Amino acid sequence: KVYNDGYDDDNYDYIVKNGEKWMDRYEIDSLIGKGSFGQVVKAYDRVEQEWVAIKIIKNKKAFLNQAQIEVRLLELMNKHDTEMKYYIVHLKRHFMFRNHLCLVFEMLSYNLYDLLRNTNFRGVSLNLTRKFAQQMCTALLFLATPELSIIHCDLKPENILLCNPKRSAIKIVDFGSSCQLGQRIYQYIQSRFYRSPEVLLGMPYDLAIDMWSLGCILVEMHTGEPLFSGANEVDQMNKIVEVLGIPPAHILDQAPKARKFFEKLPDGTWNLKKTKDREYKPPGTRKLHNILGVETGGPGGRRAGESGHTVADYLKFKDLILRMLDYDPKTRIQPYYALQHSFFK
Ligand SMILES: CCN1CCN(Cc2ccc(Nc3ncc(F)c(-c4cc(F)c5nc(C)n(C(C)C)c5c4)n3)nc2)CC1
């Protein structure tokens, strides 16, 4: 039995062959990534003499349709970013090849997990975190351009790639999960560790959900470890609550899924639910002040007396993160204002 004249496996994926040449132009090197959508391969573009990443979408209508939306968002961004100055990997071109949609990007070689793994998950410096944070806030600034109003919806270390000159810069990839404000209203979205309270609570959401993800990611960049590593949605919300306390009553009163996590008392206040069975630190007592080590030399005490890691520096970082982790999406800090924060001065 053959699929797509022998080009596909039994799962609608193009059968990648190291060394194959596509259209006398792309010399396929190796598989670099894979997922439900298809595959990403490393290839050498002989015409432009440069390494590229090619995202090969499955020969399957559902994934083709998803990726056609992705292409339209990338092309929209290209129309607003002729200088490629916003830390988003640029779509160079797209084409159909043997019944697969192919998106071609400049080739980057590492993600943020790779960088953290090289620190043995001890985290990078506050100085490097500051540079990456400014770059990510600049990307979010661009996405909130009114005509764009793009919600990435899947910010996580795997979708943040490193630029080849090392410690210079990161760039965002994977807009296959993204939508525009008021175009898709899917409810179980974001990667769980980076999932905002509004999404957990089943409430309406906007571009502020990406700023929540970014706050979580920035803490993880500096500490080496995920801030909120929930094994399921209840564990996820409970780990958020350990750090930030019970969400405001005016939010829980409007939340479809409030009762998945909390119970309203006759007093009108909200508490965590309890179970006949896990055990959590009391609400708000796992202080970000101590996660970051503001007064104790940073994470693990490893930054004691290091330039750019003074108590004053840590207090500005802590303040920015808490502004990104505001429970209220209407008052959570927005990209332009984050970029004006004293942490970046
Ligand atoms: C077990 C981990 N293995 C080995 C380590 N490896 C890290 C890694 C990841 C990516 C690259 N290279 C690269 N360069 C430019 C690009 F634009 C994309 C790109 C574009 C897209 F549109 C994507 N859409 C999705 C879903 N992905 C995912 C693959 C992130 C996209 C990636 N990728 N190099 C290394 C991961 C796999």
Author numbering: 134 to 410, 413 to 480
Which of the paper's sentences describe this entry?
DYRKs are named after their characteristic dual-specificity, as they auto-phosphorylate a conserved tyrosine in their activation loop, but phosphorylate substrates on serine and threonine residues. Based on a database search, we identified abemaciclib, an FDA-approved Cdk4/Cdk6 inhibitor used for the treatment of metastatic breast cancer, as potent inhibitor of HIPK2, HIPK3, and DYRK1A.
The backbone amino and carbonyl groups of L241 in DYRK1A form hydrogen bonds with the three nitrogen atoms of the aminopyrimidine-pyridine unit. The G-loop is fully ordered and no additional ion, as e.g., the chloride in the active site of DYRK1A with inhibitor DJM20054, is seen in our structure. Moreover, two tightly packed citrate molecules were identified in the high-resolution structure of DYRK1A, keeping the active site open like a clamp at the nucleotide exit position. Strikingly, our in vitro data show that DYRK1A is inhibited by abemaciclib (IC50 93 nM) to the same extent as Cdk4/CycD3 (IC50 78 nM) and Cdk6/CycD3 (IC50 116 nM).
